[PDB]
Design a protein around this ligand. Structure first.
Ligand code: DF9
Ligand code: DF9
Lengths: 232, 234
């Protein structure tokens, strides 16, 4: 069993990179993949870069060169669910683009042609993440995570997300692109991210202040998740 | 006699004319995409049908580069016209490509720019020069300039007005070119976009698109055919 892990930023993957033993680095298409073992479990950790295209490019390389069994997308997120606080965990049951619009041709808002309207996260991965959450006494929410190529900062951008996706629990920039690539290769995925901000007019300040905490929380969750998946 | 020209279009109607002209055609099926290998009037080509939108294009482009290692990439297909002098059927050639829907301006990046990327991706001078030569030789109407991409079909209202405000110099809008440019940038692969106008991205864009996609696909395909020939044999 080989678990794939994707994070956008150095800050989001560095704690995990530090823990990978028998570590090698694949440098390709402007991405880095760190292979080896995380607490005795085979992993391949991609630092993708920010945004949908970076993520898609990276995920494609990871799948092709490492052939992981499953994909875990980690990192920070803007919280949208009312009970989320900075540091809290969000688990995808599903990922959708909040910025895709071909509704003029009768696709669902956020759906692109040739894709499902949303991408369903894997039930077994979700169950394992929720067990870890319980064992670690974490505050978490499970639900729709929406992705776009914009940093959300209140105002019109937030209003548009609330309009189209009142049920969305968090917003970020890579998860759906990762889900989309996984869909095309029939690879199970889950998103396990931690809240850095709440996507409002204070989101820039909050993010600067709480990215470190979000990166730590998400990484600790991912470590626990990898362990649970490999060793029950 | 040793070059391989990569060509990318999103939709079947955009690649079908080119696909039909491929000698010794074969098909590679991978990651939900198709790549047609063979020769086009004697020049080795690899033609990708990527599907629609930024991720589809990125996934497709990555596979094409990894599996086929083309020397250059030509992005073909339709676009919404933004430049005044553009009519349906006319050619657009990219000088450069920017995301019209990327916004990390909150952290001081230029509008359209993603962190880790240049603010826009420049098309290859030689590729552009040859595209401009084919335009003269074919006696076509064309504009060269900035082409912008996003994951939305543009249909007037705020959608169009926002693009025109943020990119007053943009000459066309579509949904794959910048994703392709971005992937090519990361692999150090020269690209050019050579598309043809199907609509003017206004209230009427959906009707205009349905009506003039065939014309767009024809005119773009003709241009790519001449371009491949020019790149291969001067
Ligand atoms: N409010 C928000 N909107 C969109 N995404 C997020 C995220 C998740 N991220 C965090 C990452 C950074 S956003 C742009 C950026 C670039 C350089 C420095 C700081 C921030 C990007 O990979 C997506 C947290 N809060 C968000
Ligand atoms: N007004 C416009 N906005 C964005 N893109 C375009 C384009 C270029 N295309 C044409 C392609 C189709 S747009 C979405 C779509 C979906 C199903 C059926 C028809 C069109 C997509 O690859 C981007 C032409 N006019 C456009």
């Amino acid at each position: 069993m080989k678990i794939g892990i994707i994070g956008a930023m150095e800050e989001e993957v560095t704690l995990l990179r530090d823990k990978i033993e028998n570590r090698q680095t694949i440098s390709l298409g402007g991405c880095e993949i760190y292979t080896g073992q995380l607490n005795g479990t085979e992993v391949a950790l991609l630092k993708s870069g920010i945004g949908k295209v970076a993520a898609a490019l990276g995920a494609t390389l990871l799948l092709e060169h490492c052939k992981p069994d499953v994909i875990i997308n980690t990192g920070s997120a803007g919280g949208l669910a009312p009970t989320l606080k900075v540091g809290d965990i969000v688990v995808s049951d599903e990922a959708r683009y909040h910025d895709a619009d071909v509704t003029a041709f009768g696709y669902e808002y956020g759906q692109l042609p040739g894709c499902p309207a949303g991408f369903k996260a894997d039930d077994k991965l979700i169950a394992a993440a929720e067990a870890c959450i319980a064992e670690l006494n974490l505050n978490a929410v499970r639900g729709l995570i929406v992705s776009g190529d914009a940093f959300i900062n209140g105002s019109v951008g937030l209003a548009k997300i609330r309009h189209n996706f009142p049920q969305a629990i968090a917003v970020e920039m890579e998860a759906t692109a990762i889900a989309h690539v996984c869909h095309n290769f029939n690879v199970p995925f889950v998103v396990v991210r931690a809240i850095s901000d709440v996507a409002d007019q204070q989101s820039h300040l909050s993010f600067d202040e709480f990215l470190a905490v979000a990166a730590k929380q998400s990484s600790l969750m991912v470590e626990s998740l990898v362990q649970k998946l490999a060793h029950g």
